[PDB]
Amino acid sequence: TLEDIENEKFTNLEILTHLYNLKAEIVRRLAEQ
Amino acid sequence: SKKGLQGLLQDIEKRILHYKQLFFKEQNEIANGKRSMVPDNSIPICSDVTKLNFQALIDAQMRHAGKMFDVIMMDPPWQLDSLSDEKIQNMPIQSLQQDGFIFVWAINAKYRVTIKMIENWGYKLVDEITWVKKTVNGKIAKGHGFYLQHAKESCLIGVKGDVDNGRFKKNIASDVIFSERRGQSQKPEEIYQYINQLCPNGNYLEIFARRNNLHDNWVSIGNEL
Amino acid sequence: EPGEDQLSLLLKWRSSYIPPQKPTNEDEYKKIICKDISSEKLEQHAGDVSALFINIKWKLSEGQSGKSIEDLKKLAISDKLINNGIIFIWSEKEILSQIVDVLEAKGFNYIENFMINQLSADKALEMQRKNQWSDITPEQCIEQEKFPPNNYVQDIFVNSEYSFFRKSKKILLMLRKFNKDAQLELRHQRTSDIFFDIFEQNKPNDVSKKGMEFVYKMIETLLPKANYSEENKGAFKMMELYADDKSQPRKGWISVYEQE
Amino acid sequence: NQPLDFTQYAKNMRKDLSNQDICLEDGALNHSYFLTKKGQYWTPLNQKALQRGIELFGVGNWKEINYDEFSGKANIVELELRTCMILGINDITEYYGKKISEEEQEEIKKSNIAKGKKENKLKDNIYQK
DNA sequence: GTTAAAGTTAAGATGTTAAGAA
DNA sequence: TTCTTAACATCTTAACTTTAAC
Numbered sequence: 001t002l003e004d005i006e007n008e009k010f011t012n013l014e015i016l017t018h019l020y021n022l023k024a025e026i027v028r029r030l031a032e033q
Numbered sequence: 034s035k036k037g038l039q040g041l042l043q044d045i046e047k048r049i050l051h052y053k054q055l056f057f058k059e060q061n062e063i064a065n066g067k068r069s070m071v072p073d074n075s076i077p078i079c080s081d082v083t084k085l086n087f088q089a090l091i092d093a094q095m096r097h098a099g100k101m102f103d104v105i106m107m108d109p110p111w112q113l114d115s116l117s118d119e120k121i122q123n124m125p126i127q128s129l130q131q132d133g134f135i136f137v138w139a140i141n142a143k144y145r146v147t148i149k150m151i152e153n154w155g156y157k158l159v160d161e162i163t164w165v166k167k168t169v170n171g172k173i174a175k176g177h178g179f180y181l182q183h184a185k186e187s188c189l190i191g192v193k194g195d196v197d198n199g200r201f202k203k204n205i206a207s208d209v210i211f212s213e214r215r216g217q218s219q220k221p222e223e224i225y226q227y228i229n230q231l232c233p234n235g236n237y238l239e240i241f242a243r244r245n246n247l248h249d250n251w252v253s254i255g256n257e258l
Numbered sequence: 259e260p261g262e263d264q265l266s267l268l269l270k271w272r273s274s275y276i277p278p279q280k281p282t283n284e285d286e287y288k289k290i291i292c293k294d295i296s297s298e299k300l301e302q303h304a305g306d307v308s309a310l311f312i313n314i315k316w317k318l319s320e321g322q323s324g325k326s327i328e329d330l331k332k333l334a335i336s337d338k339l340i341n342n343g344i345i346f347i348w349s350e351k352e353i354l355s356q357i358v359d360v361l362e363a364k365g366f367n368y369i370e371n372f373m374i375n376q377l378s379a380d381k382a383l384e385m386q387r388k389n390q391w392s393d394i395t396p397e398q399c400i401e402q403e404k405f406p407p408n409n410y411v412q413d414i415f416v417n418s419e420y421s422f423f424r425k426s427k428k429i430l431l432m433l434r435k436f437n438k439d440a441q442l443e444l445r446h447q448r449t450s451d452i453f454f455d456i457f458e459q460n461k462p463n464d465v466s467k468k469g470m471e472f473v474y475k476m477i478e479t480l481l482p483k484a485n486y487s488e489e490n491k492g493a494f495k496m497m498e499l500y501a502d503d504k505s506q507p508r509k510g511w512i513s514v515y516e517q518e
Numbered sequence: 519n520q521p522l523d524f525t526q527y528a529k530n531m532r533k534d535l536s537n538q539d540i541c542l543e544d545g546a547l548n549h550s551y552f553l554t555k556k557g558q559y560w561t562p563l564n565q566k567a568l569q570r571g572i573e574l575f576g577v578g579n580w581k582e583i584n585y586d587e588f589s590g591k592a593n594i595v596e597l598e599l600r601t602c603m604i605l606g607i608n609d610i611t612e613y614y615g616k617k618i619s620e621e622e623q624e625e626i627k628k629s630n631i632a633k634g635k636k637e638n639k640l641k642d643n644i645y646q647k
Numbered sequence: 648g649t650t651a652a653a654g655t656t657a658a659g660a661t662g663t664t665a666a667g668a669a
Numbered sequence: 670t671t672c673t674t675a676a677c678a679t680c681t682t683a684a685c686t687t688t689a690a691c
């Protein structure tokens with residue numbers, strides 16, 4: 001969730017990539033219901 | 034959970050703002066001319082060792098320096114990133130060097146085969162240096178093993194030709210490097226200091242390298258490098 | 259406190275290893291004292307052992323006393339003397355490859371290595387002069403286990419006289435002898451492959467009584483079945499060639515001496 | 519003689535055998551690539567590629583521009599990250615679906631820099647609204 | 648409210664050995 | 670069937686939390 005994405009060993013551009021991925025998934029959820 | 038995860042959406046939008054600002058600042062510093070930890074006298078090559086042709090390296094070195102390499106380091110990706118114990122030997126080390134040294138790092142499972150490899154290329158076994166792993170408190174870092182608890186990494190030194198000249202100072206450094214673990218498979222930086230004590234002002238070649246070391250005056254063949 | 263020191267924290271098995279006294283009952287210890295292994299016949303004083311020890315003083319330089327590889331070339335080892343055992347031999351790096359192939363021709367495959375890192379007592383005394391009791395002999399440091407404080411142990415290694423990377427090491431090459439039928443009973447990991455041992459300058463080729471107890475105990479724990487317990491009477495399964503006077507007469511060992 | 523000073527020597531080796539993404543002009547280490555992880559550097563070839571690709575193709579949809587592109591190390595998130603600077607503004611919602619040539623892009627970039635400087639809130643060339 | 652003892656856990660370039668794919 | 674090859678076989682240290690005083 002919010003912690004493993006915020007990991008320091010994770011590179012910042014891939015932090016952006018996976019973090020955008022869960023934004024897309026959650027806004028798809030709000031599109032669903 | 035609609036309103037709660039809407040608040041979570043607002044949270045990750047604040048994360049968008051913070052992270053975009055952070056990366057924009059770092060990239061603007063990059064374009065401003067920020068210098069990495071790498072030194073300016075590093076010669077890297079990003080190509081597979083079994084794929085590249087070393088004759089180009091040979092005549093490039095002969096054109097730009099007039100001599101051959103002084104030290105050929107290698108920390109092979111041993112078979113236990115896979116390679117083999119024939120493809121490592123078949124590559125042309127005996128042409129890459131004429132009068133110098135070779136450091137081949139070996140595990141306890143690949144000792145006899147490494148000695149045979151070094152003796153086949155024309156070198157004669159002369160010395161061995163061992164990395165002794167350490168903990169943050171200073172105790173020996175012992176782990177795994179079958180007959181004993183392993184806390185060791187070996188490396189064997191083979192000499193091709195003559196050594197009695199201006200370079201290659203005798204009776205230097207020590208063969209035991211007591212140092213902490215700093216990676217999954219990452220040799221210490223004391224070995225490079227020992228090398229620079231051994232052959233000052235040299236043209237070193239290192240095979241199977243990573244971006245961790247990339248030192249000065251080093252030719253740093255690798256692929257993920 | 260001794261915990262903070264790096265030297266005294268690395269050297270704390272010394273108080274936990276006291277070698278036992280000399281055997282007396284004449285059943286425990288065996289002596290086959292003779293003139294030379296390469297001269298005498300073997301595999302008739304013993305048979306089917308599981309732990310072979312060769313305390314070898316390699317000559318390296320021709321002027322220095324010792325022996326060279328041709329004695330090991332002509333060494334009398336058969337399937338009767340050792341069939342399933344593991345052979346322990348002291349090795350250098352000038353003749354490491356030579357030792358490896360001369361023991362490869364007999365079937366002994368290298369399986370593991372066990373080294374000892376030297377720490378000089380003279381170096382400790384000199385460093386304690388250079389930093390500052392401390393008016394005693396290095397051998398007395400080896401005996402009393404009185405180790406002067408040192409938080410950086412990498413400076414205290416011995417200073418050799420090599421023509422290459424300076425020598426601070428002591429290697430025991432152990433080589434398996436595969437049989438695949440009778441097998442070997444062993445416990446795995448109750449020994450570290452490194453132990454930092456205190457030495458003396460101008461004499462690095464001598465491991466003390468505590469280091470000898472350490473290596474003997476790791477042999478004995480590495481091969482539990484060869485321990486003297488109700489079945490090794492006449493079935494010792496352990497000997498040492500080129501035996502020394504210290505710590506070799508042992509309950510369950512055959513001490514192969516060398517008469518002049 | 520001279521004991522082979524290593525600056526221009528290493529420059530010549532990097533001209534000869536090293537990768538093209540490590541040496542620029544005659545001799546340069548290209549430090550911008552050794553501080554970033556492998557596979558993501560945004561080479562000047564990529565810079566000119568998206569600079570010529572933002573025109574003659576529908577902006578907003580980067581899948582269709584990446585289908586005709588290398589289809590390699592061209593992940594979308596880096597594209598929306600680095601197209602902002604070509605615009606000069608972080609927000610793209612007001613700049614969706616319209617195509618602008620490069621010189622006017624630099625003009626509006628300079629205008630955004632000037633308005634950020636006058637609005638004393640610029641954070642390293644980046645303007646927020 | 649602070650200090651110390653007990654449970655935990657995660658990592659450390661092992662190897663022989665029964666099983667089975669050509 | 671046969672040699673490999675997956676496919677299984679346990680010990681120290683440093684830190685982190687949890688609980689019992691006091």
Ligand SMILES: C[S@@+](CC[C@H](N)C(=O)[O-])C[C@H]1O[C@@H](n2cnc3c(N)ncnc32)[C@H](O)[C@@H]1O
Binds near residue numbers: 080218241258
């Ligand atoms: C085990 S690492 C040794 C790195 C060294 N210990 C260091 O950290 O400086 C071996 C490296 O060799 C490279 N390598 C692996 N397989 C290779 C291959 N087949 N050809 C060329 N290079 C290879 C990879 O970069 C890999 O990380």
